[PDB]
């Protein structure tokens, strides 16, 4: 019979830097063994210091995005100031538990700045738990991307390798490398890349193409 869910796929990357948060995603929307489009950017600019990504089932992503925008407008029009990043994380977790017994099948990653002006990534789950980490890979290509960031960002399982703080452009090369290497082997990844960068001066966007199959 009718099933309430379907798997669209998607791949969301986030990296918490020292004074920056890089969030990138492909723009491919698929269903099973078909391609609906090659342009559907998973990133969304909430405020000047907050960009959210939403993968998984696409309709719940749209609905959740619009609800988050509405509640942002409610906070601003009630309290004369924008939200923080962690307040948005808490509010999204309350939403995801407020639809507990009919869950959103949507993976969610919030990257952005704190009130100290430092990078911050907040991960999520479909039922509504969250935590503040340095890097996450959401969606279909999570297992293809977590260990490489464990090698490079975490410097983990490594011997006699010092800890340099991760710069911006080196992380840009990292993001381009990992999306190319993942689109080599994933079937739910490619055709473009929408990179969103949060600085202390606004949001920068960038469009990098990928392979066309």
């Amino acid at each position: 019979r009718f099933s309430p869910y379907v798997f669209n796929g998607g791949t969301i990357l986030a990296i918490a830097g020292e004074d920056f948060a890089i969030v990138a995603s492909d723009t491919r929307l698929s269903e099973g063994f078909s391609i609906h489009t090659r342009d559907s950017p998973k990133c969304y600019k909430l405020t000047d210091k907050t960009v959210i990504g939403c993968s998984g089932f696409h309709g719940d992503c749209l609905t959740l995005t619009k609800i988050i925008e509405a509640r942002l407008k409610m906070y601003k029009h009630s309290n004369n100031k924008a939200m923080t990043t962690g307040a948005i994380a808490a509010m999204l977790s309350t939403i995801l538990y407020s639809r507990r017994f009919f869950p959103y099948y949507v993976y969610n990653i919030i990257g952005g700045l704190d009130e100290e002006g430092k990078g911050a990534v907040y991960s999520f789950d479909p039922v509504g738990s969250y935590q503040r980490d340095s890097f996450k890979a959401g969606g279909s290509a999570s297992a293809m991307l977590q260990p490489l960031l464990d090698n490079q960002v975490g410097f983990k399982n490594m011997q006699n390798v010092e800890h340099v703080p991760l710069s911006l452009d080196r992380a840009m090369r990292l993001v381009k490398d990992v999306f190319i290497s993942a689109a080599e082997r994933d079937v739910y990844t490619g055709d473009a890349l929408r990179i969103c960068i949060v600085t202390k001066e606004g949001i920068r966007e960038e469009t990098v193409s990928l392979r066309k199959d």
């Binding site: 609906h36 489009t37 309709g59």
Partner: peptide, 17 residues
Amino acid sequence: LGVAYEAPSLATGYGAY
């Protein structure tokens, strides 16, 4: 399912195949 997007060319049912 509420899945909705914009596109230069749309094709439904078997048309997408």
